[PDB]
From Swiss-Prot:
Function recorded in the entry: Peptidyl-prolyl cis/trans isomerase (PPIase) that binds to and isomerizes specific phosphorylated Ser/Thr-Pro (pSer/Thr-Pro) motifs. By inducing conformational changes in a subset of phosphorylated proteins, acts as a molecular switch in multiple cellular processes. Displays a preference for acidic residues located N-terminally to the proline bond to be isomerized. Regulates mitosis presumably by interacting with NIMA and attenuating its mitosis-promoting activity. Down-regulates kinase activity of BTK.
Complex and partners: Interacts with STIL. Interacts with KIF20B. Interacts with NEK6. Interacts (via WW domain) with PRKX. Interacts with BTK. Interacts (via PpiC domain) with DAPK1. Interacts with the phosphorylated form of RAF1. Interacts (via WW domain) with ATCAY; upon NGF stimulation. Interacts with PML (isoform PML-4). Interacts with BCL6. Interacts with FBXW7, disrupting FBXW7 dimerization and promoting FBXW7 autoubiquitination and degradation. Directly interacts with RBBP8/CtIP; this interaction depends upon RBBP8 phosphorylation.
Tissues showing expression: Expressed in immune cells in the lung (at protein level).
Residue span(s) of domain WW: 1-33
Cellular localisation: Nucleus; Nucleus speckle; Cytoplasm
Protein name as catalogued: Peptidyl-prolyl cis-trans isomerase NIMA-interacting 1
Residues of the full protein shown: 6 to 39 of 163
Organism encoding this protein: Homo sapiens
Domain comment (free text): The WW domain is required for the interaction with STIL and KIF20B.
Highest taxon of source: Eukaryota
Length: 33
């Protein structure tokens, strides 16, 4: 779903997440993408 400033990333060991590039917070909460 994602609050303001959260956008998609991935861990090289194989896991997708969403990262707040305004604070550096990281969570698995997924939007349409
Ligand atoms: C990959 O490493 C990250 C950071 O420790 C962790 O959050 C993620 O769950 C890991 N995924 C796998 C499949 O190893």
């Amino acid at each position: 779903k994602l609050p303001p400033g959260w956008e998609k990333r991935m861990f090289a060991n194989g896991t997708v997440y969403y990262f707040n590039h305004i604070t550096n917070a990281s969570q698995f909460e997924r939007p349409s993408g």
